[PDB]
Design a protein around this nucleic acid. Structure first.
Lengths: 79, 107, 98, 93, 98, 79, 106, 93
DNA sequence: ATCAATATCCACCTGCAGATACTACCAAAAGTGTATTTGGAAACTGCTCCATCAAAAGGCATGTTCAGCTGGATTCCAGCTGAACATGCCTTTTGATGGAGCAGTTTCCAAATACACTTTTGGTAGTATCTGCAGGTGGATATTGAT
DNA sequence: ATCAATATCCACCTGCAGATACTACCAAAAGTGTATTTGGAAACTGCTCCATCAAAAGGCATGTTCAGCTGGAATCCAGCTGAACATGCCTTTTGATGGAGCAGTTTCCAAATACACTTTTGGTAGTATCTGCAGGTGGATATTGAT
């Protein structure tokens, strides 16, 4: 049950960078739900690349290739 | 023997780029001026961004460009920001911005 | 005693966090989450530090980016407190649901 | 051996800003930038060429790609450096 | 003297138009608009009836959906009347503007 | 003018298909401008594809390819 | 000499597909299970939409499928509607849908 | 010569709904639909191969592709239909 | 709850726009058989780096209290937006209709490919010594909130 | 405005992680030169379909009056949520073992390419007939809105 590892303090910090001044009580669970879904979607694609490679190790390129498929391109890890 | 890059008066490797087009499998053939042109644009683009990052770094009293500087440079420029709007730069952060309606009191 | 009025520290915090670039989620908690979720898809997987690190860079990048759209939705509602339906209007208009 | 555009970016770096360095972490981000754009352009070029039953990617292909892909003012300047370079390269052999 | 309460016909217009598929913008005026805009990128151009037909089919489609999300924004404001700022918010969250 | 040719009645019809029940007076001018930007962005590429092919006629395909790279794929016009 | 589409037990042209993969520039080489596999996949997906679209037409008192029918078939199916999320079907209109809060006060 | 899947569409239609017809415009949309999915799949496959330093685009590559591209249940079946045709084709001279 | 005005539905009908059909014609496509070629699966294995464990420590999460001020509920009213006409201005049809220029076909030459060989180089592996700045510190200046 | 509490700032600085400097080795990369092949521009042009008219019809957009009802404002107050505090856990940092598995390299055959010859087919065209359904007429009935 690690989704609760995203402490209330962390989500509040993310929101401050988002420029949010006041956070409602229910935003904490709503957010964990959104993160779980974002992650679940990226890891699927990433793991699909890993399996296809016949590898047992999810590499950083696999995550990067997975992100580019979601139209969420990342820079800083070999592309 | 002069390298094709010099012949073109460029820093970016016309030879390497030409190689990547063939391996990239973008078409049956690849004309000699394709890589030349492409490498030319690649250089201009990295210069245009490094120019702005170099300044960002200066405005923070730093002398070495790190990722935050790349981020500031891209988000502050209307055009680079459009060319990389679906791009996320690791360790870059975000532009300082605080919706007005959130600032205290009045006057 | 002395205490700041409700809202002053929040701004201090926005200014603060918008000026930094470090990851805002604890490292280990995050990894157990990635490992937990991957496993629920394929067992016996392994991750490169950097692979775990790329996901976090992305994840935070995505949520920060989302809280802003959310924040705009609150304001549009003449509020200053983001609520769940704010996050939902954002994600719906973004083309992520409905 | 893994190829990078690092030595070249650095060359360009010293041109625009003579006394500025670049962390390996940022050099990495620049390397992804160059490659991203490389892929985007070559792609448009690849596709541009198909819609015309053509089998060769020429500078003319690469040039439309840059216009289609790059935003206004950036493209205008990108197209120049590009021609200027080809033209120069043409007149030598 | 018969008269329908304000909003009764509008609601009736909604049902009628979500049933049909006809283009709702007038063809000749649309073509004029396109031809004029195009003039700005290249003097004297000709257009296939189908190329304009395509253009119109895509932009009407575009506007409709923007109106859909715009409506969502109004409602979130606890209004019923869509307004300029409702379109602004919708487009700004979609990435079409800021 | 021409963008002004797109009438209030047509925009009301569009909005209606969209499910809008009440339309503020300021919406019409705001709409035409959003529309103008759409078209400019789309035609600009349709024309670019045209020029690249040495033609003086914008073909349906030219527009389809344009819409495809704007991420607005359209079915029913070949290709 | 029977055709490959037959051997694979399919309608779609396994041969046309193969030819397209080459002339399409996706790779230096192309296996043979590939044009077959890919061909089968295209067929299945075709059947899947046409099926729903027929329905749409039948349940509309019509025998001839038209764009409206393909639009209602897709937009009403979670799977398909996602596959074509950023796709616009010419002459399809939209799904009949009025936000609850806009209905007569009643 | 203008190719089009329009006639193989027609054949598929009949096994599904024999007494159902299809309008020209509708047939056009369907062709546009087949071409789209074709490209979207082939392209993702092209990519896979390259990521793995491979010159060949095999059914192995097309399968993973369908997995990455198609949603839940749709992909499941698309895979079975696919593994079927490849098998029936390999076990038949 | 009753009653007049309308909109909306449904069953039936007719005509033509566009779907269906029989037949021929053929260039491009797809199947076939043969000789050369090579991608990338195997199998053995070197060595990178991932999972793990031990440990100390202090940063930071947690749980609580308390009251500031936000959000939600509520009333209210001026004025904007919808409905309904009156009215005529312009989009639409469609048929004709020359004619621009898209698309077909023949030409032939600059340019790409293929291949053999030499030569320059960017990447790495081995060490080794600089250096920009993160993070600690002290103290003068600036913001905030109670009065 | 006065002022006491905190945060903010910045000069000042030291330690070390990360950047910079050399020396080597070298396999792949990039350049040169020649013969061989061909994609696609260029000039010619048939005919497909686009820009223009003519030209009443009446469809439908526009100006206008009127009042329903909504959006914006002003009030109020329960309690939600932010700030400050105590407290102690678990994450971060350091460090090293053991070995899983990723990645290099050599061996080599099952499948792919390259041709050439042979047979099939899908697209283009006429030329003729046929059918789903759009659009029109009623007449019934549901819906709306005033009483």
């Amino acid at each position: 049950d690690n989704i609760q590892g995203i402490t209330k303090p962390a989500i509040r910090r993310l929101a401050r960078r988002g420029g949010v001044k006041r956070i409602s009580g229910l935003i904490y669970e709503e957010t964990r739900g959104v993160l779980k879904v974002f992650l679940e979607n990226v890891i699927r694609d990433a793991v699909t690349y890993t399996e296809h490679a016949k590898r047992k190790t999810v590499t950083a390129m696999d995550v990067v290739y997975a992100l580019k498929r979601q139209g969420r391109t990342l820079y800083g890890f070999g592309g | 023997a002069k390298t094709r890059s010099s012949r073109a008066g460029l820093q970016f490797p016309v030879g390497r780029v030409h190689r990547l087009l063939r391996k990239g499998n973008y078409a049956e053939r690849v004309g000699a001026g394709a890589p030349v042109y492409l490498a030319a644009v690649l250089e201009y683009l990295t210069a245009e961004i490094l120019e702005l990052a170099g300044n960002a770094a200066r405005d923070n009293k730093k002398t070495r460009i790190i990722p935050r500087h790349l981020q500031l440079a891209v988000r502050n420029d209307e055009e680079l920001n459009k060319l990389l709007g679906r791009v996320t730069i690791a360790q870059g952060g975000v532009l300082p911005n605080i919706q007005s309606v959130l600032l205290p009191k009045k006057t | 005693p002395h205490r700041y009025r409700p809202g002053t520290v929040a701004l201090r915090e926005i200014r603060r966090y918008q000026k930094s670039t470090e990851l805002l989620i604890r490292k280990l908690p995050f990894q157990r989450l990635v490992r937990e979720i991957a496993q629920d898809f394929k067992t016996d997987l392994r991750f490169q530090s950097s692979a775990v690190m790329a996901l976090q860079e992305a994840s935070e990048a995505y949520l920060v980016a989302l809280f802003e759209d959310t924040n705009l939705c609150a304001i549009h509602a003449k509020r200053v407190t983001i609520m769940p339906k704010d996050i939902q209007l954002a994600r719906r208009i973004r083309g992520e649901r409905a | 051996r893994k190829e990078s555009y690092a030595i070249y970016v650095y060359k360009v770096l010293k041109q625009v800003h003579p006394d500025t360095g670049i962390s390996s972490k940022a050099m990495s981000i620049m390397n992804s930038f160059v490659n991203d754009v490389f892929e985007r352009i070559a792609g448009e070029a690849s596709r541009l060429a198909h819609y015309n039953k053509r089998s060769t990617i020429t500078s003319r292909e690469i040039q439309t790609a840059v216009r289609l892909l790059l935003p206004g003012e950036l493209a205008k300047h990108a197209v120049s450096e590009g021609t200027k370079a080809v033209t120069k390269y043409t007149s030598a052999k």
